[PDB]
Design a binder for these strands. Structure first.
Ligand SMILES: [Mg+2]
Ligand SMILES: [Mg+2]
Ligand SMILES: [Mg+2]
Ligand SMILES: [Mg+2]
Ligand SMILES: [Mg+2]
Ligand SMILES: [Mg+2]
Ligand SMILES: [Mg+2]
Ligand SMILES: [Mg+2]
Ligand SMILES: [Mg+2]
Ligand SMILES: [Mg+2]
Ligand SMILES: [Mg+2]
Ligand SMILES: [Mg+2]
Ligand SMILES: [Mg+2]
Ligand SMILES: [Mg+2]
Lengths: 149, 77, 271, 104
RNA sequence: GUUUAUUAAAAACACAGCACUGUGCAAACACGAAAGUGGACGUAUACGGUGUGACGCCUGCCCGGUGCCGGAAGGUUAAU
């Protein structure tokens, strides 16, 4: 599957590469998420001669909005009140929408699929580290505090 | 029914010719699979009931081509 | 309280009733009934699929709340009732906002006890709480298999399922058959054994008692003819062949578990 | 009523939140017109042998003169509080108010 | 109780009961080229199959053959 790329991907190369990947990896993951184009010679004309620097522009208007959701989101005073019991003992778990309701309200309007959790349930009341993956290149170090009721 | 919508593959019949050449009628069923295909020209998925040969055709002609062939053929999708 | 009846007539000689005076001797709560048509063991093709099912008494399906959704609203139990649909007794409960529902009855549930579902419940028999909140080792019943789906494990007369472990997102359940199954800990599960425990003590006594239950007579296979059953035939009582179902498959010991989707959940098979 | 001696063993990682628990057990004892005589936190104390795969715990002693309903109610707390490891509701004849030998 | 309508109404079948066994539920199983349906709006004290046939005292030895069940190293072995 000779396929052209529209962003840098993990173990095959960067933008403007014509990599032979397996058919399942091209059809199911890369192409629907806009990360590839099935490399017709009419598409090499559409990309490699014409849009070598124009599709390289579009990858750089996205990184400006990628570094901006890091610099203003350094506050780390995230207060979420949940019902609980005593010395831990959580009633209702904190998911990824729950973290994406306060940082949505205090920060950037971000979707729920951008929260990275090592726990995922977040039962024990208190502070917990919450990494972000708003895009697959730029990360953040934010800690969310769980508050009882 | 077991019809690939891309290639029109259809269950033909044959025989189970054994070692003593006895013939019992069997059916060669196609390798159909329901599959969703990302249509960038509509920004959605289309669920085609397509054989595994027919997915090779979509990866060669492009998905935006075969969906025009099915309109000109007269089958919904 | 089992009652060995007295031999006034042959057929009452061996009847053992199970007389529970606590059950409500009236009509059931009519907004929680619906039509429950019989089938005879006959599918949409009309053929008998499951044998030995027919007749019996007409029954009305009591809509029992297995999913048990009313979180944090404390319920009181109005009365226990008989259910012809199942082997356990059922408890008409009454919530604070006026909604009446049926539940399966736990063992220590009597007319007037309180219950409550949710996360903030009290750990005591009758309450429904997710199995990441029930302690390890307790005996629960009416256990779900998927979160919010509905109780499916330990739903019979006197059964119970223990919670032998809890490791992350799964809990390990010692099922009533002895099988160790991993179920998600977000699956809700009512505390305590399910009530009617002495249901297995009953003895029907006479041939038409099983006919009242929709259990038609079961002809054994060696009495049939060689066209009917694989066991049939012989000039006398001859059975010179291995015990097979009427469709030919072995019976005494051949394992017929063909599900490979759910073998990752089964920790240990039964003995 | 019936003089008692309740000593329990909190997990040592929960030692920072043990005085949170004290303010509710003693509240439930005095909430039933019940005396308290002594209440002596023994701190992180080394176990003689590892229970529950660890070697330390945070002991609490508490003498209590309560009715037996709010003590049986308290025994169910140590059962389903997962922070406390062991408990020992032990009965005594008289209200002992002199402090422990293992405070010194 | 039932049974060969029309040469057999029995000691035959059934039966309550007993046991082995399968089946964790989208169950096993069955009817279906499939969807689906019965099982069952039931959840192992549940369901299917097989044997025996209330009750009472009981059910002794044999795993060599044939079955089924478990073992997984070796040996042999298919397409590929
Ligand atoms: Mg021929
Ligand atoms: Mg049957
Ligand atoms: Mg029987
Ligand atoms: Mg029989
Ligand atoms: Mg015969
Ligand atoms: Mg035959
Ligand atoms: Mg003979
Ligand atoms: Mg013989
Ligand atoms: Mg005749
Ligand atoms: Mg006659
Ligand atoms: Mg017999
Ligand atoms: Mg043998
Ligand atoms: Mg042997
Ligand atoms: Mg073997």
């Amino acid at each position: 599957m000779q396929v052209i790329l529209l962003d840098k991907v993990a173990n095959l190369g960067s933008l403007g590469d014509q990599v032979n990947v397996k058919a399942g990896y091209a059809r199911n993951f890369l192409v629907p998420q806009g990360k590839a184009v099935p490399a017709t010679k009419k598409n090499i004309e559409f990309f490699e001669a014409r849009r070598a620097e124009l599709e390289a522009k579009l990858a750089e208007v996205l990184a400006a909005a990628n570094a901006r959701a890091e610099k203003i989101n350094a506050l780390e005073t995230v207060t979420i009140a949940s019902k609980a019991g005593d010395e831990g003992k959580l009633f209702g778990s904190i998911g990824t929408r729950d973290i994406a309701d306060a940082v949505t309200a205090a920060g950037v309007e971000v979707a729920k699929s951008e929260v990275r959790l090592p726990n995922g349930v977040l039962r024990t009341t208190g502070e917990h580290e919450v990494s972000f993956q708003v895009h697959s290149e730029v990360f953040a170090k934010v800690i969310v505090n769980v508050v009882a009721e | 029914s077991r019809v690939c919508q891309v290639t029109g593959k259809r269950p033909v019949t044959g025989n189970n010719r054994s070692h003593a050449l006895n013939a019992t009628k069997r059916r060669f069923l196609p390798n159909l699979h329901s599959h969703r295909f990302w249509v960038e020209s509509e920004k959605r998925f289309v669920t085609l009931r397509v054989s595994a040969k027919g997915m090779r055709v979509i990866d060669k002609k492009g998905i935006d081509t075969v969906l025009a062939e099915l309109r000109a053929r007269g089958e919904k999708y | 309280a089992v009652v060995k009846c007295k031999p006034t007539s042959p057929g009452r000689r061996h009847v053992v009733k199970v007389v529970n005076p606590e059950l409500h001797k009236g009509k059931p709560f009519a907004p929680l009934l619906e039509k429950n048509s019989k089938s005879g063991g006959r599918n949409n093709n009309g053929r008998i699929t499951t044998r030995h099912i027919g007749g019996g008494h007409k029954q009305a399906y009591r809509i029992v709340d297995f999913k048990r959704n009313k979180d944090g609203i404390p319920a009181v139990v109005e009365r226990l009732e008989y259910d012809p649909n199942r082997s356990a007794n059922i408890a008409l409960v009454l919530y604070k906002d006026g909604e009446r529902r049926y539940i399966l009855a736990p063992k220590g549930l009597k007319a007037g006890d309180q219950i409550q579902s949710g996360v903030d419940a009290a750990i005591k028999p009758g309450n429904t709480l997710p199995m990441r909140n029930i302690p390890v080792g307790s005996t629960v019943h009416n256990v779900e298999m998927k979160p919010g789906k509905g109780g499916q494990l330990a739903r019979s007369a006197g059964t119970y399922v223990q919670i032998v472990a809890r490791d992350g997102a799964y809990v390990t359940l010692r099922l009533r058959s002895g099988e160790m199954r991993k179920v998600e800990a977000d699956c809700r599960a009512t505390l305590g054994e399910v009530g009617n425990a002495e249901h297995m003590l009953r003895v029907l006594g006479k041939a038409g008692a099983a006919r009242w239950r929709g259990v038609r007579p079961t002809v054994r296979g060696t009495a049939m003819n060689p066209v009917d059953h694989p066991h049939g035939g012989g000039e006398g009582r001859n059975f010179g062949k291995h015990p097979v179902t009427p469709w030919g498959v072995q019976t005494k010991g051949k394992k017929t578990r063909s599900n490979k989707r759910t073998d990752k959940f089964i920790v240990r098979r039964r003995s | 009523m019936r003089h008692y001696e309740i000593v329990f063993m909190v997990h040592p990682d929960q030692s920072e939140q043990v005085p949170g628990m004290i303010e509710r057990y003693t509240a439930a004892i005095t909430g039933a017109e019940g005396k308290i005589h002594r209440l002596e936190d023994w701190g992180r104390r080394q176990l003689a042998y590892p229970i529950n795969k660890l070697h330390k715990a945070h002991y609490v002693l508490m003498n209590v003169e309560a009715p037996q309903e709010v003590i049986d109610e308290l025994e169910t707390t140590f059962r389903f509080n997962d922070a406390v490891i062991r408990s020992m509701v032990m009965r005594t004849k008289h209200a002992v108010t002199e402090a422990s030998p293992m405070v010194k």
